[PDB]
Every structure is written in structure tokens, then in C-alpha cells.
């Protein structure tokens, strides 16, 4: 219960950090950090308001968030952790000594705690209409 | 031991803290579940049905939402005021001209009259920004994210001096049907979280709130969050022995088996401070499967925010402290004799959205993709329910009764809840006729 609860706070902190919307200037000399998103856009994206020739980039990219969520999912995913072993004998030895059905159920509970966030809200969904039309 | 001692030691229960409309006594009581009660979701695709879509925002997608938000209001105000055409921000003009844009700040600090800038629309100004000068303006009230039409002079093309500011035009009220005029007296009890004191977990405010509900026998009971506050010290210290997911079930069944005898409909609306739920604004309706056949006829889950028609009256249900969202970062020209809560309420009612503020403050997550489709006014709601950490107040602004009962519990001192009367008067008359004649905010 405590592990899942702390995971809940950690994931909430991460998602709020992403939605904060902090942007950073790509130019090493400028390093402009603003919360307001300018409407002046360049070819690559937003244009820095301090220096006129630079592209603002998100501080926390979606790739970083997805990688963090996948890391949290993987650290409690025993199903893929057991098949990684090259030998079936060692896998069975480790499964029958500690990975009891209750232990597997708890690990799956953590995995499902992650999967509740990873299930509907996502990034792995690709809209074909936006891609073609 | 020491926890919940202060809550039990107070003996000032019973007195009303404020009332609005007509004078009423203490014996507030209704028929409960008797008669016909219509609780219907109205407006856009109803209060979003699924949980959500994603948490991945393409950067070039928020711009279209912002463009639509600016352009729809600008065109509506242009048709209302019969303005011939708009002018780009960067186009110089010696003659006075009308500009269309959004108010904003040029830094990360608090907005002031000197630092007000106007950011134009993409169709006309191609997303430009110019500072504005308010010295030559008699009356104004500006906050970031407000869409207005600004009349002024822009000679050098880099600064716009105001001459006149157009007043926001609210959307026309809902048109009652002939069926809505045949109903009887209706009661709407409203309570808002938190439901416990800031140092104990006995949930005693929830318990005596349920007791008040049972004694009142009301018709509708609207419960706002946070049922599980995200700022409660035990929440972030992970000292509990039960998951907040299960803490949700016991909190639900508390009210469920506490209000079975009353028989009143329950409308549970989440809040952004609900730690256990998805932190997205707007927030989806709560998920709960342990509901019996009797309970499903009395328990209804509505998303946050939403516009719900109760007995033909459009109640605007929102859990965000929108008063603190707006008035904390808004400027004005008059401060001697002016009503603040009223002007923020008017600004909320005129911008045709549930959250005009752009940008928001440091800590609250909004997904802009569904903001355009699930955070707008279909019609001007007849009653606004806007809880706030500020003082409770019920006021009539723009012919609409706005109610702010505040929190049920405020730290170690008790808060307030509200009860409202509603009926449909005769259709004929002097047009505007508020269905909610009587409101009464009483502390728990
Ligand atoms: Zn820069």
C-alpha cells in the first residue's frame, strides 16, 4: 500500500512538472526561461522573446515523460523480468522460492497501478486522420 | 486524542451566516425524492463521457485552440457592437482605430497597469504583441487571458494608447420550455470540501454534514471536492495504511449509506485537489462500480467542471477556486467604492468560458485540446456555484444569482454550506426572472 501510494505521489509530481509548460532557450548565451508561450513561431517552433534568433524548447519533453513512465512500469514488471533469464532452470528456481502467487499478485498490482495511467491517457496512440488528411 | 478536539469543542452550531432573496426561518425541509426531479447534462457533448484521450500535447495544437477562443469572442463582440472591421497591431494609424487581442503581461511578475500588453489574433495581427497605455482611459478592469476589443491610437506602431474599452457582452439566458414551468418546489443543497479538519482524519465534518442532509430532506445534494485533499499533511507523508483508491471507497459508502433514508439525489463533482484521481482540467467523472440498483437511481457522477440542468435551471458546477484564480491577478481603475467579487463574476460570465485565465498560476494542469470543447458556456447559467477560500457570499450579477458557500472545513475552524430554493415562475413578465429566489448560506 505504501509503495503504491508513494508511486502515486511521484507520478503526480512528474505529470504536474510536465504540464507546468516551462520552456528554455536553445542558445547557450541567452538561456531564457519563460512560462508564457509566445505566439511568434519560427519554422522549428516558438521564437525566443529575449533574443530574436533562437528556438524555445520544452524543458521536459514528452519523450522524457514516457521514458520515466516506462521505467516505473518496468521496475515492477516481473512478467518480463522472468523471461529475460537465458536459463529456464534458474527462472524456475527464482519463481518457486519467492515468486509465490501472492507475491506475483502484488507485483501485478504495482504494474496495474502504473497501467491505469498508461492505459487510456497516452502517446502510443497514432491518429491516422491527422497523419493522412 | 488532541486531534478533532477543537471541532467538537465549539458550541455555536445553527445560526445562518448569510441569506439572499426573501426572509426565511430555520425550518428548511422538502419532500425529498417525491415528485419529478430532472437532472440532465446540457450543452456540448455531455460533460465528456470517456475518461480522457491522452497526456501528449503537440506544441502546434494549442495555438488553434487559442485562436478559436480569441476569434469567436471577437466576432461575436464585433456583431454586437456593429464594428466595421479590426486593425492589425503592427499597422500604424493616426486616426483612432479598434484593435482585437488578449490582455497579458510582459514578465513573470505580477501584472500592473504599466506592463499591460495586447497580443493579437493570428488572422489579423499574426500573433503580435504591443504594449498599451491606460493613462487616457477612464474606467477599466483587466486580467491576463481576457478577450476584449480595445479602441485607441497606435501612431508609432509599437504602443497603443487607450481611448475607450468595450464592455463584455454575456450570452443570452437559457430559454425555458413549457414543460419546465409545470414543476413544483425544488431544493438544492451544496457542500464543498474538505470534509475534515486539517489535523485529524475522523471525517466528523462529513458525518454531521450527512446528518444535516438527513434532517433537511432536500431534493438535490451537490458535493464538491476535495474529498481527499492533496494538501492534507498526512496525504504527502504517506503515513496511511490504506490506499487513497480504497480511501475513496470508504468515503463514498459513508455518504451512500448515510443518505439512504433521505432519498435525495446525489451529484458528486470532483476537484483538482483530488490526489487519487487523474490531475487533468477538465476532470472526468468519477468511476465507481459498488452501486446497487436503488443507489444508481439516487447517485449520479458528473465531471468537473460541468453545466447541469436541475429542474430546468442551468447550474454551473465548478470546483476550481476561480475567484482566487482571477481576482488575485487582476487590475482595476477604481478602488474606493467598487464591488470586487461582482466584477470578477461579471468577467467570468462575459468571457464565455469556464477558465479565461491565460497563463494560469504555477500549479494546476490544464489540457488545452479538450479545453475548447469542454470548458465553454453553452448558455449563461442561471445559478453559479463557485466555492472559494475567500468569504462566503451570494450576489446577483447581470441578472444571475452567484453563490459562494466556501469550504465546509477551513483548517481548524469550520466553514459553510448552502441551500437554494428554485421554482419556475410565469413565462410572461419583464423578461428576466430568476428561478432561484432564495439562497441561504449557513455554517456547518
Ligand atoms: Zn533567447
Curated annotation (Swiss-Prot), chain A:
Residues annotated as binding Zn(2+) 2: 25, 30, 48, 51
Location(s), subcellular: Nucleus; Cytoplasm, Cytosol
Motif, CysB motif: chain positions: 25-51
Superkingdom field: Eukaryota
Subunit structure: Component of the alpha DNA polymerase complex (also known as the alpha DNA polymerase-primase complex) consisting of four subunits: the catalytic subunit POLA1, the regulatory subunit POLA2, and the primase complex subunits PRIM1 and PRIM2 respectively. Interacts with PARP1; this interaction functions as part of the control of replication fork progression. Interacts with MCM10 and WDHD1; these interactions recruit the polymerase alpha complex to the pre-replicative complex bound to DNA. (Microbial infection) Interacts with SV40 Large T antigen; this interaction allows viral DNA replication.
Further details from the record: In eukaryotes there are five DNA polymerases: alpha, beta, gamma, delta, and epsilon which are responsible for different reactions of DNA synthesis.
Family designation: Belongs to the DNA polymerase type-B family.
Involvement in disease: Pigmentary disorder, reticulate, with systemic manifestations, X-linked: An X-linked recessive disorder characterized by recurrent infections and sterile inflammation in various organs. Diffuse skin hyperpigmentation with a distinctive reticulate pattern is universally evident by early childhood. This is later followed in many patients by hypohidrosis, corneal inflammation and scarring, enterocolitis that resembles inflammatory bowel disease, and recurrent urethral strictures. Melanin and amyloid deposition is present in the dermis. Van Esch-O'Driscoll syndrome: An X-linked recessive syndrome characterized by different degrees of intellectual disability, moderate to severe short stature, microcephaly, hypogonadism, and variable congenital malformations.
Domain statement: The CysA-type zinc finger is required for PCNA-binding.
General function of this protein: Catalytic subunit of the DNA polymerase alpha complex (also known as the alpha DNA polymerase-primase complex) which plays an essential role in the initiation of DNA synthesis. During the S phase of the cell cycle, the DNA polymerase alpha complex (composed of a catalytic subunit POLA1, a regulatory subunit POLA2 and two primase subunits PRIM1 and PRIM2) is recruited to DNA at the replicative forks via direct interactions with MCM10 and WDHD1. The primase subunit of the polymerase alpha complex initiates DNA synthesis by oligomerising short RNA primers on both leading and lagging strands.
Protein name, UniProt field: DNA polymerase alpha catalytic subunit
Species this protein is from: Homo sapiens (Human)
Taxonomic path: Eukaryota, Metazoa, Chordata, Craniata, Vertebrata
Curated annotation (Swiss-Prot), chain B:
Source species: Homo sapiens (Human)
Protein name in the entry: DNA polymerase alpha subunit B
Gene name as annotated: POLA2
Subunit composition and interactions: Component of the alpha DNA polymerase complex (also known as the alpha DNA polymerase-primase complex) consisting of four subunits: the catalytic subunit POLA1, the regulatory subunit POLA2, and primase complex subunits PRIM1 and PRIM2 respectively. Within the complex, POLA1 directly interacts with PRIM2/p58.
Record keyword Phosphoprotein present: yes
Lineage: Eukaryota, Metazoa, Chordata, Craniata, Vertebrata
Nucleus keyword on record: yes
Molecular-function GO terms, alphabetical: DNA binding
Primary localization class, coarse: nucleus
GO biological process, one term: DNA replication
Subcellular location: Nucleus
PTM statement from Swiss-Prot or TrEMBL: Phosphorylated in a cell cycle-dependent manner, in G2/M phase.
Amino acid at each position: 500500500v505504501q509503495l503504491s501510494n508513494k508511486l502515486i505521489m511521484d507520478i503526480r509530481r512528474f505529470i504536474k512538472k510536465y504540464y507546468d509548460g516551462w520552456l528554455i532557450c536553445e542558445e547557450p548565451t541567452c538561456r531564457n526561461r519563460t512560462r508564457h508561450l509566445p505566439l511568434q513561431f519560427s519554422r522549428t517552433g516558438p521564437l525566443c522573446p529575449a533574443c530574436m534568433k533562437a528556438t524555445l524548447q520544452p524543458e521536459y519533453s514528452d519523450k522524457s515523460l514516457y521514458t520515466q513512465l516506462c521505467f516505473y512500469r518496468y521496475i515492477f514488471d516481473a512478467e518480463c523480468a522472468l523471461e529475460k533469464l537465458t536459463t529456464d532452470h534458474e527462472k524456475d528456481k527464482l519463481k518457486k522460492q519467492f515468486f509465490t502467487p501472492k507475491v506475483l499478485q502484488d507485483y501485478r498490482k504495482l504494474k496495474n497501478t502504473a497501467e491505469q495511467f498508461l492505459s487510456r491517457s497516452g502517446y502510443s496512440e497514432v491518429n491516422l486522420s491527422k497523419l493522412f488528411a | 486524542a488532541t486531534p478533532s478536539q477543537k471541532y467538537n469543542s465549539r458550541s455555536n452550531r445553527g445560526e445562518v451566516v448569510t441569506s439572499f432573496g426573501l426572509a426565511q426561518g430555520v425550518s428548511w425541509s422538502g419532500r425529498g425524492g417525491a415528485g419529478n426531479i430532472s437532472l440532465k447534462v446540457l450543452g456540448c457533448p455531455e460533460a465528456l463521457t470517456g475518461s480522457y484521450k491522452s497526456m501528449f500535447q503537440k506544441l502546434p495544437d494549442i495555438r488553434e485552440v487559442l485562436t478559436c477562443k480569441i476569434e469567436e469572442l471577437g466576432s461575436e463582440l464585433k456583431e454586437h457592437y456593429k464594428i466595421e472591421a479590426f486593425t492589425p497591431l503592427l499597422a500604424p494609424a493616426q486616426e483612432p482605430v479598434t484593435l482585437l487581442g488578449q490582455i497579458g503581461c510582459d514578465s513573470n511578475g505580477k501584472l500592473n497597469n504599466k506592463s499591460v500588453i495586447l497580443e493579437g489574433d493570428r488572422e489579423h495581427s499574426s500573433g503580435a504583441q504591443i504594449p498599451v497605455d491606460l493613462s487616457e482611459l477612464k474606467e477599466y478592469s483587466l486580467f491576463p487571458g481576457q478577450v476584449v476589443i480595445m479602441e485607441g491610437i497606435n501612431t508609432t506602431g509599437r504602443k497603443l494608447v487607450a481611448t475607450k474599452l468595450y464592455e463584455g457582452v454575456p450570452l443570452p439566458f437559457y430559454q425555458p420550455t413549457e414543460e419546465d414551468a409545470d414543476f413544483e418546489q425544488s431544493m438544492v443543497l451544496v457542500a464543498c470540501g474538505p470534509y475534515t479538519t486539517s489535523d485529524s482524519i475522523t471525517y466528523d465534518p462529513l458525518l454531521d454534514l450527512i446528518a444535516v442532509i438527513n434532517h433537511d430532506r432536500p431534493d438535490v445534494c451537490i458535493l464538491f471536492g476535495p474529498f481527499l485533499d492533496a494538501k492534507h499533511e498526512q496525504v504527502e507523508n504517506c503515513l496511511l495504511t490504506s490506499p487513497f483508491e480504497d480511501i475513496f471507497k470508504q468515503c463514498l459508502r459513508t455518504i451512500i449509506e448515510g443518505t439512504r433514508s433521505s432519498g435525495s439525489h446525489l451529484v458528486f463533482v470532483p476537484s483538482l485537489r483530488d490526489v487519487h484521481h487523474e490531475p487533468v482540467y477538465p476532470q472526468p467523472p468519477f468511476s465507481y462500480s459498488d452501486l446497487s440498483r436503488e443507489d444508481k437511481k439516487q447517485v449520479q457522477f458528473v465531471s468537473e467542471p460541468c453545466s447541469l440542468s436541475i429542474n430546468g435551471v442551468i447550474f454551473g458546477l465548478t470546483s476550481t477556486d476561480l475567484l482566487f484564480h482571477l481576482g488575485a491577478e487582476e487590475i482595476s481603475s477604481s478602488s474606493g467604492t467598487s464591488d470586487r467579487f461582482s466584477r470578477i463574476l461579471k468577467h467570468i460570465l462575459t468571457q464565455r468560458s469556464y477558465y479565461p485565465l491565460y497563463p494560469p498560476q504555477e500549479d494546476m494542469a490544464i489540457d488545452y485540446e479538450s479545453f475548447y470543447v469542454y470548458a465553454q458556456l453553452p448558455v449563461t447559467p442561471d445559478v453559479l456555484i463557485i466555492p472559494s477560500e475567500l468569504r462566503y457570499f451570494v450576489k446577483d450579477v447581470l441578472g444571475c444569482v452567484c453563490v459562494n458557500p466556501g469550504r465546509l472545513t477551513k483548517g481548524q475552524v469550520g466553514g459553510t454550506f448552502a441551500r437554494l430554493y428554485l421554482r419556475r415562475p410565469a413565462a410572461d413578465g419583464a423578461e428576466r426572472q430568476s428561478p432561484c429566489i432564495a439562497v441561504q448560506v449557513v455554517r456547518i
